[PDB]
């Protein structure tokens, strides 16, 4: 879960800050196929221009698969 | 390998500029595995606050494989 005092950042780096962790530890899931995004590929989110997609009420990411879909 | 009059810095981004290439095209080898790092691994190296380890005279790096051990 992610509630107060956390505000649920819309940015990957900030999301890790509120979660009290690093981008190397936080593992996000795909919003489309719901697959686990490998930490190595998670860095591509910050490397390229991608925003965090919130599915229902949780922070999700776009995998290398769905990346070309949107 | 790297020789004069190249400056050969310890930072990957600067090395790319000196080599007149990009981080996507630059080829780095592992100091441990002795193999060539993958494009995804090179991105990780540039994402982390790591420096290039010069061994024997060739700019070697540390892939995610050895990186998790340290
Ligand atoms: Zn996906
Ligand atoms: Zn290695």
Swiss-Prot record, chains A, B:
GO cellular component: host cell cytoplasm; host cell nucleus
Protein species of origin: Human papillomavirus type 16
Subunit annotation: Forms homodimers. Interacts with ubiquitin-protein ligase UBE3A/E6-AP and thus forms a complex with human TP53. Interacts with human NFX1 and MAGI3. Interacts with human IRF3; this interaction inhibits the establishment of antiviral state. Interacts with human TYK2; this interaction inhibits JAK-STAT activation by interferon alpha. Interacts with host DLG1; this interaction leads to the proteasomal degradation of DLG1.
Keyword terms of this UniProt record: Activator, DNA-binding, Early protein, Host cytoplasm, Host nucleus, Host-virus interaction, Inhibition of host innate immune response by virus, Inhibition of host IRF3 by virus, Inhibition of host RLR pathway by virus, Metal-binding, Modulation of host cell apoptosis by virus, Oncogene, Transcription, Transcription regulation, Viral immunoevasion, Zinc, Zinc-finger
GO terms for biological process, alphabetical: DNA-templated transcription; positive regulation of transcription by RNA polymerase II; regulation of Cdc42 protein signal transduction; regulation of proteolysis; symbiont-mediated perturbation of host ubiquitin-like protein modification; symbiont-mediated suppression of host apoptosis; symbiont-mediated suppression of host cytoplasmic pattern recognition receptor signaling pathway via inhibition of IRF3 activity; symbiont-mediated suppression of host transcription
Originating gene: E6
Further comment: Belongs to the high risk human alphapapillomavirus family. The cancer-causing human papillomavirus E6 protein has a unique carboxy terminal PDZ domain containing substrate.
Family label: Belongs to the papillomaviridae E6 protein family.
Residue ranges covered by zinc fingers (unnamed): 30-66
Tagged with keyword Transcription regulation: yes
Function recorded in the entry: Plays a major role in the induction and maintenance of cellular transformation. Acts mainly as an oncoprotein by stimulating the destruction of many host cell key regulatory proteins. E6 associates with host UBE3A/E6-AP ubiquitin-protein ligase, and inactivates tumor suppressors TP53 and TP73 by targeting them to the 26S proteasome for degradation. In turn, DNA damage and chromosomal instabilities increase and lead to cell proliferation and cancer development.
Residues of the full protein shown: 8 to 77 of 158
UniProt protein name: Protein E6
Compartments it resides in: Host cytoplasm; Host nucleus
Statement: the UniProt record of this protein carries the keyword Transcription regulation: yes
Entry GO MF terms: DNA binding; identical protein binding; PDZ domain binding; zinc ion binding
Principal place of residence: host cell
Top-rank taxon: Viruses
């Amino acid at each position: 879960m992610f509630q107060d005092p956390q505000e649920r950042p819309r940015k990957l780096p900030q999301l890790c800050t509120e979660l009290q962790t690093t981008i190397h530890d936080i593992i996000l899931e795909c919003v489309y196929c719901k697959q686990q995004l490998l930490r190595r590929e998670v860095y591509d989110f910050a490397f390229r221009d991608l925003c965090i997609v919130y599915r229902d009420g949780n922070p999700y990411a776009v995998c290398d698969k769905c990346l070309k879909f949107y």
